[PDB]
Amino acid sequence: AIKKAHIEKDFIAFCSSTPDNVSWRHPTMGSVFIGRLIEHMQEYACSCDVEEIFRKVRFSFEQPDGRAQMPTTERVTLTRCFYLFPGH
């Protein structure tokens, strides 16, 4: 027997900046968004789901400086909370 399934589901995309806008990269320290994501993943993977971690990353960019960017979550079809449960 065959069953129907959603073609697109359980996706989440996290981009470094909003449409039309730039993303920044330090020539020796690396990309700002990437470094910020790693920092937040290391800290919040244990206690938060990926949607919440991504929100926290956006918040860390809230106060703009000379080099400003606002990371964006796009095309979400997560129907559940995705916890990484690091260590398990």
């Binding site: 589901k9 359980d10 470094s16 909003t18 020796t28 320290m29 703009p64 964006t72 690091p86």
Partner: protein, 168 residues
């Protein structure tokens, strides 16, 4: 301790795990074959070199491994090569015994999408975000059905600084 497999990622304890029907199921650590792909474009034909990309590769690769993923790293690919590689990654049988995946794209970017190695204003070489989802969805990647697919993109979405002025 950072000497372990999870490195600098803070561990989720057994009491913490129990405290957390609304969650994606996690496969047994012993049997699961978690996969992740990183595509990073550093060297280009026309667009200036992406200095510091090696720090991003090192960082993301170590992090994804820390979270339990076997990481495939591919560098300096055209939009056609990325499509081919993403198609190849979708066909990997380890996905069947995996509970999730992570895709990382790092390159120069425009409004239309991610730049390949041969990109120029005259002869564009762009991978659209729409193409990434299509190759990883239930039709083209049935192995990752009902499983979280996380896409990370480091790129410009255009030329604008993304700021407006306001007074106090």
């Amino acid at each position: 301790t950072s000497s372990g497999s999870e490195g600098n990622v803070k561990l989720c304890s057994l009491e913490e795990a129990q405290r957390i029907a609304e969650i994606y199921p996690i496969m047994d650590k012993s049997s699961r074959t978690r996969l992740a792909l990183i595509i990073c474009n550093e060297e280009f034909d026309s667009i200036p070199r992406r200095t510091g990309a090696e720090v991003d590769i090192t960082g993301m690769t170590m992090l994804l491994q820390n979270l339990g993923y076997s990481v495939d790293v591919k560098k300096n690919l055209t939009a056609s090569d990325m499509t081919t590689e993403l198609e190849a990654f979708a066909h990997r049988p380890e996905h069947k015994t995996s509970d999730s995946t992570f895709l990382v794209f790092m390159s120069h970017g425009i409004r239309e999408g991610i730049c390949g190695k041969k990109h120029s204003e005259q002869v564009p070489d762009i991978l659209q975000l729409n193409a990434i989802f299509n190759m990883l969805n239930t039709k083209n990647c049935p192995s990752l059905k009902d499983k979280p697919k996380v896409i990370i993109i480091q790129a410009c979405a255009g030329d604008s600084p993304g700021v407006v002025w306001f007074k106090d």
